[PDB]
Structure formats: structure tokens, C-alpha cells
Amino acid sequence: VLSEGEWQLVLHVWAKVEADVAGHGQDIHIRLYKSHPETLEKHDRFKHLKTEAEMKASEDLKKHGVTVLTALGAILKKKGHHEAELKPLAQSHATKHKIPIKYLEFISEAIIHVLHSRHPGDFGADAQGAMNKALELFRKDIAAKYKELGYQG
Numbered sequence: 436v437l438s439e440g441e442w443q444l445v446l447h448v449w450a451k452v453e454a455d456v457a458g459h460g461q462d463i464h465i466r467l468y469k470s471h472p473e474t475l476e477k478h479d480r481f482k483h484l485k486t487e488a489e490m491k492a493s494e495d496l497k498k499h500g501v502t503v504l505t506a507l508g509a510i511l512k513k514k515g516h517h518e519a520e521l522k523p524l525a526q527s528h529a530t531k532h533k534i535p536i537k538y539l540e541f542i543s544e545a546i547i548h549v550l551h552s553r554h555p556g557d558f559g560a561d562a563q564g565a566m567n568k569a570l571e572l573f574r575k576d577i578a579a580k581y582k583e584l585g586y587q588g
């Protein structure tokens with residue numbers, strides 16, 4: 436659905452994410468929890484992290500962010516051909532964690548915010564539009580997998 440040029444813009448900025456996955460992941464989660472506080476309630480082990488410095492120093496949160504972004508990067512590198520990578524994520528997020536698609540919108544907003552904050556010269560309007568399209572495709576396809584598992588979130 437994305438053009439090849441759009442995928443190239445997505446993967447160009449993703450290579451910059453991969454220079455510091457941990458740091459990008461922490462900034463994305465800090466942004467997510469600040470912008471949309473309801474999302475932190477899904478994480479029991481992160482609730483005692485009350486300040487930004489605590490969140491940055493938390494190995495548990497840091498490792499979680501790398502897990503999250505690694506999964507997302509592997510999906511993005513498939514350029515839409517991602518059923519195999521996407522199914523297990525849908526399974527856990529639909530049936531165990533119970534993450535509504537709206538929360539996937541919230542973290543998508545945080546990803547775009549952090550990428551622009553860190554890489555404005557590599558993340559202008561066309562690259563933002565390409566990343567938005569890629570994350571829209573991800574959210575569309577994961578919502579279809581949610582429903583196949585019986586989850587309407």
C-alpha cells in the first residue's frame with residue numbers, strides 16, 4: 436500500500452532509531468505516559484517510577500522499550516508483508532494485555548513525536564507522512580487480527 440519511496444523514508448529514519456534503540460524507546464514511553472496517562476495503568480511494574488529520571492534509569496522499562504521497538508522495526512522492514520511477525524503480537528496484545536487500538540494510536544503519536552524531536556533533518560513532512568502510513572497499516576492489520584481472535588478493542 437505504501438510506495439517503495441515511502442518505505443525507503445520509513446527505513447531511513449528507522450536506521451537512525453537503531454543507533455540508540457534503548458534511548459528512543461524510553462523517550463517514546465515517557466512521552467506516551469505523559470500525553471495519555473491511562474496507558475501507564477497497563478504496566479504494574481512501572482507504576483512506582485514517578486519521575487522522568489526514574490523512568491530513564493529503570494532497566495526494566497529500558498529493556499521493555501527495546502523489546503517493543505525491535506518488534507516494530509522487524510514489522511516495518513517487511514514493508515507490509517508482515518502477517519507472520521504481526522500474529523504473535525496481536526495474540527498477546529488482544530488476549531493477555533488487552534490493548535485497545537486507540538492505545539496503539541497513542542504510542543504511534545509518541546513515536547512520531549520522538550522521531551521528529553531527535554531527527555528533524557531526516558524526518559520532514561514526507562517522511563512523517565510515510566511513517567504515519569506505515570503505522571496506520573500496522574494498526575489496521577493488527578485490528579483485523581484482534582477481531583479474528585475475538586477481541587473488539
Ligand code: HEM
Nearest residue numbers: 474477478502503504506507524527528532534538539542
Ligand atoms: C508499537 C506498538 C507496540 C509494539 C510493537 C509492542 C510490542 C510488545 C512486545 C514485543 C512485547 C513482549 C512480548 C509480548 O508480550 O507480546 C510487549 C509486551 C507488552 N506490551 Fe506491547 N507493544 C506495543 C504497544 C503497547 C501499548 C500501547 C501498550 C499499553 C498501553 C502495551 C502493553 C504491553 C504490556 C502490558 C506488555 C507486557 C509487558 C511485561 O509484562 O513485561 N504495548 N509489547
